[PDB]
Design a protein around this ligand. Structure first.
Ligand SMILES: C[S@@+](CC[C@H](N)C(=O)[O-])C[C@H]1O[C@@H](n2cnc3c(N)ncnc32)[C@H](O)[C@@H]1O
Ligand SMILES: [Zn+2]
Ligand SMILES: [Zn+2]
Ligand SMILES: [Zn+2]
Lengths: 97, 228, 105, 93, 78, 101, 78, 104, 91
DNA sequence: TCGGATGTATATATCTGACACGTGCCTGGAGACTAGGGAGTAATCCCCTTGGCGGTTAAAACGCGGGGGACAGCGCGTACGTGCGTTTAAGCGGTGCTAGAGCTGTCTACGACCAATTGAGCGGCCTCGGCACCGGGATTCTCGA
DNA sequence: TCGAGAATCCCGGTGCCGAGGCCGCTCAATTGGTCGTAGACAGCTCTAGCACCGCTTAAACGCACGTACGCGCTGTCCCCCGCGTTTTAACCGCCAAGGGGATTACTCCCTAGTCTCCAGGCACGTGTCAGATATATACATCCGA
C-alpha cells in the first residue's frame, strides 16, 4: 500500500526527459505514416534511411516547441491542465492558423 | 378620462417633425453612416432582421438604420422605430397633487419604446431670455431638456405628449439618445414590465440654480425631498 | 618558394577555397582581394567562439569529446549565439532543463 | 570515387589550437560544417545585395564588413570586424 | 490508418520533455492533426524537389531544403 | 432648471470608436513629436544626420501596423484569459509567443 | 523627453483601431518601450545603410531595405 | 519588326524581363521560354489582384481603386492572404471585426 | 528616364474593368508587388538551378519556382496560363 | 401700412485638381550570323533499397481507486469609462539660405585570363584508448505515523 | 515533528569500435605576365532640407463622478494519475533479389557576342468634369415707426 502523490512522478519524468536526448516517436509507425501521406503526391516513391530520421527530428523539435508555448498559455490562464484551446491560441498568435 | 388629451392638443401646439432655430445645429460630429452586418431580408412577410436578441450592431451601438443608405439589409426594418413612429397607446390622466400625469394604458414589457420626446431646439444665448421671460410671466412648470453641452430642447409652446410625465425616485423608465440621419433625438424606454394603471415616470436629475426649490410628492422610501 | 595566402594573412581557414566559392557562387561579376581574407577571419573567429563554449561544456560535464548535446548547451546558454541561431534546429541536441515555478511544490 | 570537400580539418585545427586536449565526433563535425556553410551563404548573400543596391560590380572588403555589421548582433559584430580588420592589415603589409 | 500509430504514451513523453505537468484527454487528436498538417507540407515540398530532380529517391538534402524554405534550418544531415 | 436624464453606459461609445477607427484609414500618431523622437533616437547612432519626409512616413506606416497587430494579439490573449481589460502580462505573453523576447 | 510625445489618447486610439474595449493604466509605458525598441532596431539598420552608401541623408529606400531585413515588406514607397 | 510580347500573346513585356534576368546575376545562361513563362505568371497575378480590387471598388460605389480597396481585396481572399502574409500595405488599414465577447 | 510598370497595369486594368481608374499610390503598390513577386520567383529559380549543378534557368526551373512559391489553387492556374503562353510562343 | 435689412441660389461667368490625351526623341528592343560549350542520350556497374522470417521482450493496452484541480456562484471596492472647462501646441501659409544629392570628364590602378608547377588535401588501412554496459554499496527524497 | 521504501549516484571490472595517425596520389592553388575597363577624384549645378515667424483652432489635461468587473473565497464533482495485469508488435539478426543513381563517352544545337536598323515609352504640353466661387435679384421674412 505504498503510493506517491500525483505530480511527483510527473516532475520526475519531466527531469528525465529533459535530461535524456533520444528518439521518442517510434521509427516504423512514423515511417508508415510518412509513406502513407506520401502516396497522395506521387506513386511508387523510394525513401532513404536518413530522410526519415530528418523528418522525425524536425517533427519532434516542432512538437516540443509547440507544447512549451502551450504550457505557457495554460499557466497564463491560471490552470495546470492543458486544453486544446491553448494549442489553438499558441498556433494562432504564432501565425500558422 | 382621455378628454384631457384632446384638451392638451388645444393647449399647446402639437408637432410631428423636428424644427430648429438654425440650420447648422450641434449634431453627431462624424457622419459616414456606419452600417450593419446582418444580411437577412424577409421582404415577403415581416422583416425580422433588426430585432432584439440578435447581432444588430446598430441596435447595440444605438444607431438608427436608414432605408436608402443601409445596403444588404432590406427596405424596412424593426429598428426603425422613430421614422415610422411606432409609438405606444397613451392616456393623460389626473393625479393627486402633481397635475396631469401620464398613466400607462396596457402592459408594456421591459426595454420597449413608448413615446419620443419632441419640441423646439433653443440656443443658450436665447435660453437666457427664455428663462427670464418664463420666470417673470410666472409659469407653473418647466419643460426643458439637455441635448448637448451648449444646446437645449424647449417644449413649452411647441412640444409633444411626453412633456407631461412627472418625477419619481423609484422610476420605471429611462432615456437614451439616438443618431437619426445626423439628428440627436430623444426616446423613453421601459425599465421593468409596466402594468396596467401605472404612471410612467423617470429620473430628471435636474440641476436648478434659480430662486425656487420645488418639492416632490412621490412618497416612496427612497426619496430625498428636493429636486437635484 | 611558394607560400599560401592563409599563412600570409595569419589565418587557419583557407583563402583560395573561399575565393573560388565567391567566384563560382554567382554573387557578382568581379571579386576583390581582401574580401575572402576578411570573411575567412570572420568565420575563424565564429568557429573559435563556438568551440570555446563547446569545450567548456565538455569539461564541465566531465567528458572529452564534443557531442551535439554539448553543442546545444553551448549555443543555448549564450545570449548572442542564441539570437543568431534563433531559427536553427540542431539534431540530437534536445532542450534545456527548465521547470516553471508554478508547477513544482 | 569523387572527392568531397569539407571544412573538417580546418575546424579540427581551430579546435586543437583553442583546446590542447579535446576530441570531437563525426556528427558534431558535420554540424560545424553545416554552420560554417550557413554563415558563409548568409554573409555572401547580404554582400551581394549590398553590391546590387549601390550599382556596383566588385565585392570589396567594405561590403563584407557592412554585411557582418548588419548580420551579427551586438558585441560579436565588433570583435568580428576587429579581427577581420587585423587580418586585412596583416595581409596588406 | 497509420496516424493512430502515434500512441498516447508518446505524446505524453513529448509533453514531459516540453515541461507539462498534467495533460487532458482532448490533446491527442489535435496533436495528431497538427503533426499531419506539418508533415504533409514538408513531404509536399520534398516530393516537389524530387520530381524536379527527375529521380525516384527522396534524399535527405531535399528534406533539408524543404525545411529551409519553411525556416527550420536543420543541422546534421548533409 | 434643466433636467439631465441621459448618461452613456461604458462600452457604447467605446464600440462606436472601435467601428470608427476600423472604418477610417489615417495617421493616428502626431507627426512632429514622432519626428522629434526619431531624430533623438537617431542622434545616438550618427552625429549630424539629415532626413527626408518619405523615410519618416515609412517609419510611421511601419510603426502603426506593428502596434495595431500587437494590440490585436494582446486582445486575443486577454479574451483567452477570461477578461476584457488588457494587462501588460498579455503584452509580454504575445511578445514571447511571437518570438520577439 | 520625446518619448512622452506618444500621448495617452494616441495609444488608446491605436487600441480602438485594434479592437480593444477596456484598457488598464500600465499599458502606456510598455507600449512606449516596445515602440522605442522597434524604432531603434529599424533606425540602426537605416543608419548602417546610410553610412555604407557614402551619403549623409537617410532616404526611404534605406528604410524599406531595413524593414525587408526585419521581415516586414512595405508596399507604397519603392 | 514584331515584338516578342505580341508573338507570345501577352500584355506584360518579355525583353525587359529577359534583360532583368541577364542583369540581376541569377545564373550564367538564361533560356528562351523563361521570360515568356514568368511574364504570363506576373500577368495572371496582376489580373487577379486588379479583378478583386475592381470588385471591392464596385462594392462601395467608387470609380477609382484606392489602397483601402487593395487592402480589402488582398485580405478577403484565402490564397492571396497566404501569399502576402507578412507584407504591410501603406494606407490600407485593417479588416473591420468585433469579437463576440465584447458585445453587450 | 526611370523604368517602371505603370502603363502595363493600365493595359491590364482596361481589359479587366473598362469603366474604372486607379490612383498613383495604388500604382506604386502594384509596382512594388510586381517587383517583389519577380524577385522571389527569380531567387527561387536561381536556387533550384544551383541545386542541380546546372548553369541555365529554363521554363522548367520557373515552373518549379512557381509550384514552390504559390499556394495550391493559384499555382495550377499560373502553370496553365504559362504553359499556354509558351505553347502559343513556340507555335 | 411704410421704410429698412437679410438667408436662399440659380443665371452668368470663373479658379483648383489629379488624372486623361497629342508629339519629340533617343535609347533600348528586334533581325541575321558565327562559334563553341553546356546539355541530351546510350551503356554499365554496383550498392543501396525493399521484402521475408524467427526469437525476445520493452512497451502499449486495459481496469480501478481516489483526490485534487476546473468550474459555478457570491460579494467587495476600486479604478477606469464619460464630460466639461481650461490650456497647449499641432497644422498651415510665407520667406530665406545652403549642405549636399545628382550628373560629367580623365585616366590610373585593379581584377579577368592563360600557361607551367608543385605543394596541399581527399581517400584507404591499422590501432589503441574512451565511453558503453553491468554488479555491488552508500546516499538522498517520499510519505503515512 | 521522522523510519520503511523507492530512486539515484560512486566505484570498479569488462570490451569494442571508431577518432586519429600514416602514406600514396591527383589537382587546384600559386606565380608570372598582359590587357581591358571600374570607379576615385575633381568639378559644376540646383534642390529639397532646415530654420524662423504669425495665425487659428482642434487636441490634450486635470478633475469630478460613478458603477461594473477583477479578484478573493467557498463548494463540488469528475476525470486524470499511479499501479497492477495482460497482450503485441517493435528491435535485432539474417539472407536474397533488383532497380535506379553515378559514371563515361559521344554528339548536337542553343544561346552569348557582334553589328545594324528602327520604333516605343518617357517627358512635356493641353483638356477634362467634379468641386467649388465673385455679382445679383425674386421669394419671402422679420424689425422699427
Ligand atoms: C407632467 S409636467 C407638469 C405637470 C402638470 N401637467 C402641470 O400642469 O403642472 C412635469 C412638471 O411637473 C413637476 N413635477 C415633477 N415631479 C413632481 C412631483 N413629484 N410633485 C409635484 N410636481 C412635480 C415638474 O416641475 C415638471 O415641471
Ligand atoms: Zn442590422
Ligand atoms: Zn437594418
Ligand atoms: Zn421626490
Amino acid at each position: 500500500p505504498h503510493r506517491y502523490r500525483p505530480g511527483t512522478v510527473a516532475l520526475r519524468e519531466i527531469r528525465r526527459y529533459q535530461k535524456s536526448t533520444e528518439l521518442l516517436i517510434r521509427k516504423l509507425p512514423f515511417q508508415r505514416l510518412v509513406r502513407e501521406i506520401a502516396q497522395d503526391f506521387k506513386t511508387d516513391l523510394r525513401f532513404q534511411s536518413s530522410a526519415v530520421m530528418a523528418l522525425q527530428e524536425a517533427s519532434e523539435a516542432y512538437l516540443v516547441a509547440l507544447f512549451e508555448d502551450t504550457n505557457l498559455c495554460a499557466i497564463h490562464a491560471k490552470r495546470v491542465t492543458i486544453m486544446p484551446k491553448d494549442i489553438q491560441l499558441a498556433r494562432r498568435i504564432r501565425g500558422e492558423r | 378620462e382621455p378628454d384631457l388629451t384632446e384638451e392638451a392638443l388645444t393647449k399647446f401646439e402639437n408637432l410631428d417633425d423636428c424644427i430648429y432655430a438654425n440650420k447648422r445645429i450641434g449634431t453627431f460630429k462624424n457622419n459616414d453612416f456606419m452600417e450593419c452586418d446582418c444580411y437577412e431580408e424577409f421582404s415577403d412577410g415581416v422583416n425580422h432582421a433588426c430585432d432584439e436578441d440578435s447581432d444588430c450592431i446598430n441596435r447595440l451601438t444605438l444607431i438608427e438604420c436608414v432605408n436608402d443608405l443601409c445596403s444588404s439589409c432590406g427596405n424596412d426594418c424593426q429598428n426603425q422605430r422613430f421614422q415610422k413612429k411606432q409609438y405606444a397607446p397613451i392616456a393623460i390622466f389626473k393625479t393627486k397633487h402633481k397635475g396631469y400625469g401620464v398613466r400607462a394604458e396596457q402592459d408594456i414589457e421591459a426595454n420597449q419604446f413608448i413615446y419620443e420626446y419632441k419640441g423646439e431646439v433653443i440656443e443658450e444665448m436665447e435660453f437666457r431670455d427664455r428663462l427670464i421671460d418664463y420666470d417673470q410671466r410666472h409659469f407653473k412648470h418647466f419643460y426643458f431638456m439637455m441635448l448637448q453641452n451648449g444646446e437645449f430642447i424647449d417644449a413649452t409652446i411647441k412640444g409633444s405628449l411626453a412633456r407631461f410625465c412627472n418625477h419619481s425616485c423609484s422610476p420605471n423608465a429611462y432615456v437614451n439618445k439616438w443618431v437619426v440621419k445626423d439628428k440627436l433625438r430623444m426616446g423613453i424606454f421601459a425599465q421593468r414590465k409596466i402594468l396596467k394603471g401605472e404612471e410612467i415616470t423617470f429620473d430628471y436629475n435636474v440641476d436648478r440654480y434659480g430662486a425656487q426649490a420645488q418639492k416632490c410628492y412621490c412618497e416612496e422610501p427612497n426619496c430625498i425631498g428636493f429636486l437635484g | 618558394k611558394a607560400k599560401t595566402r592563409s599563412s600570409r594573412a595569419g589565418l587557419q581557414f583557407p583563402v583560395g577555397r573561399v575565393h573560388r566559392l565567391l567566384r563560382k557562387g554567382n554573387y557578382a561579376e568581379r571579386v576583390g582581394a581582401g574580401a575572402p581574407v576578411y570573411l575567412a577571419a570572420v568565420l575563424e573567429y565564429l568557429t573559435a567562439e563556438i568551440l570555446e563554449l563547446a569545450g567548456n561544456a565538455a569539461r564541465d560535464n566531465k567528458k572529452t569529446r564534443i557531442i551535439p548535446r554539448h553543442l546545444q548547451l553551448a549555443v543555448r546558454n549564450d545570449e548572442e549565439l542564441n539570437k543568431l541561431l534563433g531559427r536553427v534546429t540542431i539534431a540530437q541536441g534536445g532542450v534545456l532543463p527548465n521547470i516553471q515555478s508554478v508547477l513544482l511544490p | 570515387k569523387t572527392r568531397k570537400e569539407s571544412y573538417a580539418i580546418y575546424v579540427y585545427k581551430v579546435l586543437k589550437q583553442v583546446h590542447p586536449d579535446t576530441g570531437i565526433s563525426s556528427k558534431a563535425m558535420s554540424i560545424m560544417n553545416s554552420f560554417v556553410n550557413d554563415v558563409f551563404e548568409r554573409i555572401a548573400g547580404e554582400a551581394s545585395r549590398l553590391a546590387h543596391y549601390n550599382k556596383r560590380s566588385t565585392i570589396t572588403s567594405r561590403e563584407i564588413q557592412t554585411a557582418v555589421r548588419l548580420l551579427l548582433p551586438g558585441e560579436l559584430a565588433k570583435h568580428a570586424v576587429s579581427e577581420g580588420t587585423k587580418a586585412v592589415t596583416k595581409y596588406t603589409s | 490508418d497509420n496516424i493512430q500509430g502515434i500512441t498516447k504514451p508518446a505524446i505524453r513523453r513529448l509533453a514531459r520533455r516540453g515541461g507539462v505537468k498534467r495533460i487532458s484527454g482532448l490533446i491527442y487528436e489535435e496533436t495528431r492533426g497538427v503533426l499531419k498538417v506539418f508533415l504533409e507540407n514538408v513531404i509536399r515540398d520534398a516530393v516537389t524537389y524530387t520530381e524536379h530532380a527527375k529521380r525516384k529517391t527522396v534524399t535527405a538534402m531535399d528534406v533539408v531544403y524543404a525545411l529551409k524554405r519553411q525556416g527550420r534550418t536543420l543541422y546534421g544531415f548533409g
